[PDB]
């Protein structure tokens, strides 16, 4: 609904940001032929956003954007990860392998061209409208003969929106060189650590720093020691005037993906197959790993980062099943299709009613093999660990039925198996959690649709799933270290052949890509009935009011710093401060211990010119901004243009707004500017970042 | 900020007045005439209730009346999980044991008990406290045969702010109360035990009682003559609602408070009492939990021990959240420091000496008071084998006439009570492994109950092993153990039985400790005295309440919300679309009465809903209100009822010994909720029909 609008509409949407309060001119903020606010923006390490904040090519991002480097450099003699870093000098900010900047140089709408090269149809069922080997092609054609060469640094991609009806083409110019400037503890970058991932109030100051460095003359160039700070077209403002209740504010970014274009059918689908059975099957697998680890405290530090990666996408589909039930998602999709069904019918244009049509059968036809591939996917390819244990390969399996090649087969199967488990893996924990696992996935996977192996159960070993996982690991080669090391004094085929855990490992992944083969010939008839769909759409209400779906491409949202009521008598207001920091303080819990200097900048009140008119310090905010992942580290602006923020996250009420806005709900989850500069100030003591920095009062 | 005495009220009217009173003074209570405080009773000897009809309909909580509901329960008319309607008068249930108190009559006694207390000769004597000898003055002053004289009258006097006041109060009790209306556990406890302490709160917690009488309106115990009392007074329901900062107030029994407590008693209530009751719960409870998710037999067993447990554990939680961030050991060091400039000022050094009596007090029982907390809450609450039976010493000589049958029989019938179909042995010994291994850590090998020795002594500091020994050679270890005792009982076997060992041995420490801790509190409460005299000598008795002590008071406030942490608010009221929210079908806890759910979904909510046609369920104040405040009921500016006090947040337990202006709140049914209730889902017309309605 209030959405992720392309470049190009900022000149139809110009008109109602004014009115919302927006003051800077429209040209100012994105100008196809010339230097604008777009320029200070850029896509950090291929996922995140960023932003240059100095005439010397600083850039902010969020502490989790920046997080892989801190780590890199983080040594147990300078731990950065856990104190933060500082770079006191040019000279002193740390390069970093593999890591980019990506400047959105310029954006082109190419529909016309793209759609008469498609006219040269061999099939008009053809997917190469969609395909990204098709696009880069006619991409090179448009931009000219060795482009890359004749332009260094420069690169040109082309990409489909509101599916295949829109083309655009931008012109990147990427660095190579950023350089970590840097970044605050992790108690401050991370400080409700998973507890309060997608929780509002937020008291987290994820933020880190980096420097685009570039040859003498700005240009793109790989780590060298001869490099120099990129001076930059535009760079951001920042303000120290901080925000209001009802300020307008925007944001710009990379979001990743969304589905507001979904079917009623496809919503059903993604309620009752994709989140129900992941919910319900990482329920029982987190069940079982808690129990463990609540009882165990070794088995507490070998599963911990386990647990976590499997909560996050089960908090995600939680808060989506919640929009679903309370919030009309569904009902909205029915009615956004049978209006566009009805215009088509008083058009004299059916196409528009058969191609909902046909998402619909496809959906309905293609129900049991997605709840079968979701069944295998949740409950055994994630949810059980031997299930990732070793399969000897075409080739090792040759090189041990006479040569050297034998000790070379072993060792490469010795690696796997190391790898497999390894220092956090638990055996005992990887046989209770595969029970509950497997006697939730037999009960609902009928015999005939079971992977070859798990037909044991009924048929060897009488129904009983703890006396086959039993022997599976009692009997197998990579059941313990000890059954390895005689496997490997004596290596037979035959043994491989037959062992109980390879036979599961083997049957499973078969049925998993089985499944996958299966269910792929689907995705083709629902995006071409979607291309018919979108056109439909946006011929009957315009392209004014309904934004492409993100496709980690350059978007701008807007809205206002407003909170908002979650539930009956509570309401969350549009700020937080550093006394909610100190109210969640707990010594004894590493997500929550509040680093001693910013403690005593709370108990002093040494707070400069970052605190609010009340005195009181900011935190975070957050705001009506319609963002997704990808928009981690988007720069938020002020009426003016000045930076007030870095988003960092988006609460669980709005992970339904990927598919539907939601209003009263979603909000964007940002940390204040003025904290930030507060930790580079009062924790940091690095002056030499604000210096460069240009701040208005 | 105060449970003030009626007596009080002459001296606050005028700022109740000025935070939205409208009522007169003497209509509100009035010491020598009828007044609003003649329609407030004590409902079953804890309870508040009030009179809300000509005909004597009474309304409290739900919780106040559970017991009542659950006894005319049956697995045919489970009157607990539906609901309960009498249709007519002749339906009304009749209860066993209940009573309702008026107090008729309060009266300022300190001058005539201060002259009775000149003959007790021995200046540290305790009989100014003692209920047996206040109640020999009460006695005294209302003459030789005052209850015959005047039936169903009876007399009290009570001391309030350590010693240095008095009142009588003359009480008129009805013991015929009968069940008239209840709603469905689901309404009147919609949190269970998840909501407890919690606000926002979706509670229609409240039951309806009648009390009869004699034909001439006099008390009388259970009779079919009996007919309804036709009170002097009743209160007038409003239908008006609540806005933010409407003015509120409550008349209640409030049970006790320590608003008198020394700095040396805040840290004593924290480091003592309150960490070792959150240390052992927690232990207790950790293993509860996971052997109740494991086994679904275990669940139903022991849902009821663990939700008791739970209760206190999270009183402790929020009393200890105000002592570290609500500043009342400062505050309290503060007002002791104050008056001891203040004494030093005056030249007399008693307030001092009084402070550092308490002071030292303390401090010379800590050791003492802590291995009393850490066996009660370890062991003599934290062990169910440690309630195992104990052979008396008559049993004891049977066994070694031949009544050694009916000695067998005794034995059998508290080891069936102890082993009951909740009991499960396994989960026992896991329990008890898990507190012994606490307990032994913190009492060092000299303070132990002489069994716990062995854990050293015989079983190589093995826990596991000890508790094993334990259940594996008892006579009460298993029915079958028990058998082969009782068809062969020999003395020897019971006398060396390490589980009767065990029992006698805690239980004789436990003892041993309370004998040893009871002298300490008499200097203190003496010491208590001087220094509340002296605090009511320097500031006054106006800004200053005695403590409560289960006796009549009335609090006022408004009708306000607050914020618990940094951006979160919660508002003042909630409506029942906060109870849809709630519903989850599978979870019993949480399941919603199918005839609410529909007035909800069909907007049938008649003159009950507010102005923008939300339905109201519970509001908040900032009344003053503890346990014994359950079904108080709480008066607009005109004295009208608008809701019943059913509960206070756990930010404001520490209220009890410091009011929490910005936290504390009362939890409140509202009274359009009630009548929603008894209209909408108990169809019982006839009680709204008696009562007096105001629009
Ligand atoms: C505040 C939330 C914390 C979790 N995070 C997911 C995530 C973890 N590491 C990342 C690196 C880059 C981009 C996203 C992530 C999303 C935001
Ligand atoms: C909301 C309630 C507040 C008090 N209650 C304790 C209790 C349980 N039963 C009772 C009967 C009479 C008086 C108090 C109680 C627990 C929950
Ligand atoms: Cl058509
Ligand atoms: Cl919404
Ligand atoms: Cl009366």
Redo the contacts between chains.
């Keep these: 609904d209030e959405g992720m609008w392309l470049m190009q509409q900022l000149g139809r949407k110009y008109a109602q940001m004014k009115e919302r309060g927006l003051k800077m001119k429209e040209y100012d903020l994105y100008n196809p032929n010339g230097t604008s606010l777009k320029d200070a923006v850029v896509l950090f390490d291929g996922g995140c956003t960023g932003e240059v904040v100095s005439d010397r090519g600083l850039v902010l991002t969020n502490h989790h954007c920046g997080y892989d480097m801190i780590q890199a450099h983080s040594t147990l003699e300078h731990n950065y990860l856990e104190n933060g870093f500082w770079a006191m000098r040019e000279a002193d900010e740390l390069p970093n392998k593999d890591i980019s900047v990506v400047f959105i140089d310029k954006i082109e709408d190419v529909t016309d061209y793209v759609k008469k090269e498609l006219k040269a149809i061999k099939d008009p069922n053809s997917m190469d409208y969609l395909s990204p080997k098709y696009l880069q092609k006619l991409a090179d054609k448009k931009a000219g003969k060795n482009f890359s060469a004749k332009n260094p640094g420069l690169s040109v991609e082309i990409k489909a929106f509101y599916g295949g009806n829109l083309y655009l083409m931008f012109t990147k110019k990427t660095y190579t060189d950023v350089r970590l400037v840097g970044a605050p503890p992790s108690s401050i970058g991370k400080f409700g650590a998973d507890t309060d991932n997608w929780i509002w109030?937020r008291?987290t100051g994820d933020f880190s720093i980096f420097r685009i460095y570039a040859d003498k003359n700005g240009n793109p160039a790989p780590y060298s020691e001869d490099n120099v700070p990129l001076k930059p077209k535009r760079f951001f403002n920042i303000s120290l005037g901080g925000v209001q209740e009802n300020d307008y504010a925007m944001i710009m970014g990379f979001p990743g993906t969304t589905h507001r274009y979904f079917t009623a059918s496809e919503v059903d689908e993604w309620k009752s197959i994709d989140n129900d059975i992941r919910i319900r099957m990482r329920d029982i697998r987190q069940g079982v790993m808690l129990?463990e680890m609540?009882?165990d405290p070794q088995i507490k530090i070998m599963y911990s980062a386990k647990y976590a990666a499997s909560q996050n996408a089960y908090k995600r589909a939680i808060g989506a099943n919640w929009a679903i039930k309370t919030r009309g998602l569904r009902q909205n999709k029915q009615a956004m299709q049978d209006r566009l069904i009805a215009w088509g019918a008083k058009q004299g244009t059916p196409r528009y009613e058969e191609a909902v049509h046909e998402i619909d059968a496809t959906v309905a036809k293609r129900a049991d093999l997605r709840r079968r591939y979701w069944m295998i996917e949740e409950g055994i390819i994630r949810g059980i660990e031997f299930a990732r244990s070793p399969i000897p390969t075409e080739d090792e399996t040759k090189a041990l039925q006479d040569a050297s090649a034998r000790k070379e087969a072993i060792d490469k199967i010795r690696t796997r198996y190391s790898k497999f488990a390894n220092k956090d893996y638990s055996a005992e924990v990887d046989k209770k959690v595969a029970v509950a696992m497997l006697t939730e996935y037999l009960k609902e996977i009928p015999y005939e649709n079971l992977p070859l192996h798990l037909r044991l159960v009924k048929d060897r070993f009488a129904g009983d799933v703890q006396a086959y996982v039993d022997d599976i690991f009692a009997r197998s080669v990579f059941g313990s270290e000890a059954q390895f090391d005689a496997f490997a004094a004596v290596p037979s085929v035959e043994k491989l052949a037959e062992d109980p855990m390879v036979l599961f490992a083997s049957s499973v992944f078969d049925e998993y890509r089985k499944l996958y083969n299966e269910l792929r010939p689907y995705d083709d008839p629902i995006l071409r009935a979607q291309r018919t769909y979108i056109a439909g759409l946006l011929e009957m209400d315009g392209d004014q009011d309904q934004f492409p779906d993100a496709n980690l491409t350059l978007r701008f949202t807007y809205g206002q710093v407003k909170?908002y009521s979650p539930?009956?008598?509570?309401?969350?207001?549009?700020?937080?401060?550093l006394?909610?920091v100190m109210?969640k303080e707990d010594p004894d819990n590493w997500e929550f211990v509040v680093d001693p200097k910013l403690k005593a900048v709370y108990e002093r009140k040494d707070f400069g010119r970052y605190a609010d008119r009340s005195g009181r310090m900011p935190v975070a905010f957050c705001a009506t901004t319609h963002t997704t992942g990808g928009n981690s580290g988007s720069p938020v602006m002020n009426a003016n243009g000045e930076l007030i923020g870095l988003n960092f996250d988006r609460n669980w009420e709005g992970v339904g707004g990927d598919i539907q806005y939601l209003a009263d709900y979603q909000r964007s989850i940002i940390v204040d500017i003025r904290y930030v500069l507060l930790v580079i100030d009062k924790v940091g003591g690095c002056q030499r970042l604000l210096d460069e920095m240009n701040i208005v009062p």
């Design positions: 109030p008291h129990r609540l009882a909170g539930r009956d008598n509570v309401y969350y207001g549009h700020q937080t401060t006394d909610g109210e």
